[PDB]
């Protein structure tokens, strides 16, 4: 097993989900995710998706290996992937501002990744439709070429037209509350319809677009990095803080006036508002977003 050969060097992420370490393996950095004992269904789901489906795409965090090892006198579940030293989009947006080309590169490569997940590919070399269910800026990494890749398939849902079998797994984990779509927060989401989960992804992608656009300079200014709904919920908002803001008060992120004086940001403002329709079926698709961003 690889697990015992990897040298863990420093912790680069920690939460209720577990930890991620920068590790050394075969003379290279690798990312090692060590799952909390409470989150093993996530490791199960990610391993399934990376080893059984062979998910591989330039805008999807690149799988290396999945492993069971016992360190420190207990058995841990490890996921090992490429390590992106630029870190998460969430951190990246805090340490730098963006020009037009860099902003569009970022958001388009996210669209590319999410389209690839959402769309079914038939044949000997293919994949079922996949919905992410926890898309956020901390689950997006920034590559050295300035594109991004989507990470954390632990909540993935799958569907194939071959079988008409919706596969939601058995994970008790739920999405990051700050990013939950209205229909999740008010528990009217249609849980047996695969499209529902794609539309939850599109809502969260809209929020990520907002986070990114704020950091694009126009007429010499930018907004500070903030997370969606920073102004109306505390850190680590409860399910009820979000339900009140998003469902009862029907809040959406505010568009800064200066965006309408720049054409790219105007275009992006139009997109993100069409990810935020309360009616889930009215929201844009990943492929549509991808197509529009390509033209901008
Ligand atoms: C193994 O599994 C996963 C690894 C990663 C992952 C991959 N590459 C790099 C990183 C990272 C490296 C360094 C920093 C620190 N910053 C500060 C300033 C610059 C760098 C942040 C993040 C991480 C977390 C992410 C996952 O999900 C979110 C994983 O779970 C699927």
UniProtKB/Swiss-Prot annotation:
Entry's EC annotation: 2.7.11.30
Which reaction is catalysed here?
A: L-threonyl-[receptor-protein] + ATP = O-phospho-L-threonyl-[receptor-protein] + ADP + H(+); L-seryl-[receptor-protein] + ATP = O-phospho-L-seryl-[receptor-protein] + ADP + H(+)
Q: Name all Protein kinase domain ranges.
A: 6-296
- The annotated active site, in chain numbering, is 134
Q: What is the effect of changing residue 126 to W?
A: In FOP; variant phenotype
List UniProt keywords, sorted A-Z. ATP-binding, Disease variant, Glycoprotein, Kinase, Magnesium, Manganese, Membrane, Metal-binding, Nucleotide-binding, Phosphoprotein, Receptor, Serine/threonine-protein kinase, Signal, Transferase, Transmembrane, Transmembrane helix
Tissue specificity annotation: Expressed in normal parenchymal cells, endothelial cells, fibroblasts and tumor-derived epithelial cells.
Q: Per its UniProt entry, what is the enzyme's top EC class, as one word?
A: transferase
Q: Where in the cell is it found?
A: Membrane
Assembly mode: Interacts with FKBP1A. Interacts with FCHO1. Interacts with CLU. Interacts with type II receptors AMHR2 and ACVR2A. Interacts with BMP7. Interacts with GDF2/BMP9. Interacts with BMP6 (when glycosylated); the interaction may induce HAMP expression. Interacts with TSC22D1/TSC-22.
Q: What does this protein do?
A: Bone morphogenetic protein (BMP) type I receptor that is involved in a wide variety of biological processes, including bone, heart, cartilage, nervous, and reproductive system development and regulation. As a type I receptor, forms heterotetrameric receptor complexes with the type II receptors AMHR2, ACVR2A or ACVR2B. Upon binding of ligands such as BMP7 or GDF2/BMP9 to the heteromeric complexes, type II receptors transphosphorylate ACVR1 intracellular domain. In turn, ACVR1 kinase domain is activated and subsequently phosphorylates SMAD1/5/8 proteins that transduce the signal.
Which disorder does the record name?
Fibrodysplasia ossificans progressiva: A rare autosomal dominant connective tissue disorder resulting in skeletal malformations and progressive extraskeletal ossification. Heterotopic ossification begins in childhood and can be induced by trauma or may occur without warning. Bone formation is episodic and progressive, leading to a debilitating ankylosis of all major joints of the axial and appendicular skeleton, rendering movement impossible.
Recorded protein name is Activin receptor type-1
What organism is listed for this UniProt entry?
Answer: Homo sapiens (Human)
Where in the full protein does the shown chain start and end, and how long is the full protein? 203 to 498 of 509
């Amino acid at each position: 097993t690889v697990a015992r050969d990897i040298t863990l060097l420093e912790c680069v992420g920690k939460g209720r989900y577990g930890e991620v370490w920068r590790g050394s393996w075969q003379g290279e950095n690798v990312a090692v995710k060590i799952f909390s004992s409470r989150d093993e269904k996530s490791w199960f789901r990610e391993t399934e998706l990376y080893n059984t489906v062979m998910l591989r795409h330039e805008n999807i965090l690149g799988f290396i290996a999945s492993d069971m090892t016992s360190r420190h006198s207990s058995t841990q579940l490890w996921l090992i992937t490429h390590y992106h030293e630029m870190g998460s989009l969430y951190d990246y947006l805090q340490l730098t501002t963006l020009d037009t080309v860099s902003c569009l590169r970022i958001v388009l490569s996210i669209a590319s990744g999410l389209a690839h997940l959402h769309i079914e590919i038939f044949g000997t070399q293919g994949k079922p439709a996949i919905a992410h269910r926890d898309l956020k800026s901390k689950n997006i990494l920034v590559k050295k070429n300035g594109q991004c890749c989507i990470a954390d398939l632990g909540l993935a849902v799958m569907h194939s037209q071959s079988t008409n079998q919706l596969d939601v797994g058995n994970n008790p984990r739920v999405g990051t509350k700050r990013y939950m779509a209205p229909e999740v927060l008010d528990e009217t989401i249609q849980v047996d319809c695969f499209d529902s989960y794609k539309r939850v992804d599109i809502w969260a992608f809209g929020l990520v677009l907002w986070e990114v656009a704020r950091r694009m300079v126009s007429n010499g200014i930018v907004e500070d990095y903030k997370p969606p709904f920073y102004d109306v919920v505390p850190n680590d908002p409860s399910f009820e803080d979000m339900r009140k803001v998003v469902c009862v008060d029907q809040q959406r992120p505010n568009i800064p006036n200066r965006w309408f004086s720049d054409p790219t940001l105007t275009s992006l403002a139009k997109l993100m508002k069409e990810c935020w329709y309360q009616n889930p079926s009215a929201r844009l698709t990943a492929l549509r977003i991808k197509k529009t961003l390509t033209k901008i």
